[PDB]
């Protein structure tokens, strides 16, 4: 069976034991969403930083809604690379999304990034991490 962490479900500052490692974004927070808000011209990104420890493989699960194309991505510190795990198209709903994660390294960062850079604005809640795949992936949510 898989391990779950759940990063956060409804926020109103950084995650407990996260810090923030992204760019030209500022964060705020309203009815239990973190908020993105990317700056233009800067392809912004949330990166949120575990302060201790990593997750290997398994899937992402998240709520989202984002005005524009948003790439997932997660990041080896030590190693200093990153590997693409998603991108995901606009909506104005929430959607949950479950996503396998096949980079082969640990990694510690988790990023959203805003793809076109034209500041389109994202809503993330409900972030969960699973050892397991996304085809398995039993929602704690």
């Given at each position: 069976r898989?391990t779950?962490?759940?990063?956060?479900?409804?926020?109103?500052?950084?995650?407990?034991?996260?810090?923030?490692?992204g760019?030209?974004?500022?964060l705020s927070?309203?009815?239990?969403?973190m908020?993105?808000?990317?700056?233009?011209?800067?392809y912004g990104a949330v990166?949120?930083?575990?302060?201790?420890?990593?997750?290997?493989?398994?899937s992402?699960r998240?709520?989202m809604?984002?005005?524009?194309?948003?790439?997932?991505?997660?990041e080896?510190?030590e190693?200093d690379?990153?590997?693409?795990?998603?991108?995901?198209?606009?909506?104005?709903?929430?959607?949950?999304?479950i996503?396998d994660?096949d980079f082969d390294?640990?990694?510690?960062?988790?990023?959203?990034?805003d793809?076109?850079?034209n500041?389109?604005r994202i809503?993330?809640k409900?972030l969960?991490?699973?050892?397991?795949?996304?085809?398995?992936?039993?929602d704690?949510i």
């Amino acid at each position: 069976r898989a391990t779950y962490t759940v990063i956060f479900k409804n926020a109103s500052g950084l995650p407990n034991g996260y810090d923030n490692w992204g760019w030209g974004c500022t964060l705020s927070y309203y009815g239990g969403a973190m908020i993105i808000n990317p700056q233009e011209g800067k392809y912004g990104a949330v990166s949120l930083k575990r302060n201790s420890g990593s997750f290997r493989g398994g899937s992402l699960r998240f709520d989202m809604k984002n005005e524009g194309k948003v790439k997932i991505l997660v990041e080896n510190s030590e190693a200093d690379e990153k590997f693409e795990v998603e991108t995901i198209s606009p909506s104005d709903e929430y959607v949950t999304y479950i996503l396998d994660v096949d980079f082969d390294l640990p990694f510690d960062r988790i990023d959203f990034q805003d793809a076109p850079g034209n500041g389109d604005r994202i809503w993330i809640k409900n972030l969960v991490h699973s050892t397991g795949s996304a085809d398995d992936f039993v929602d704690p949510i």
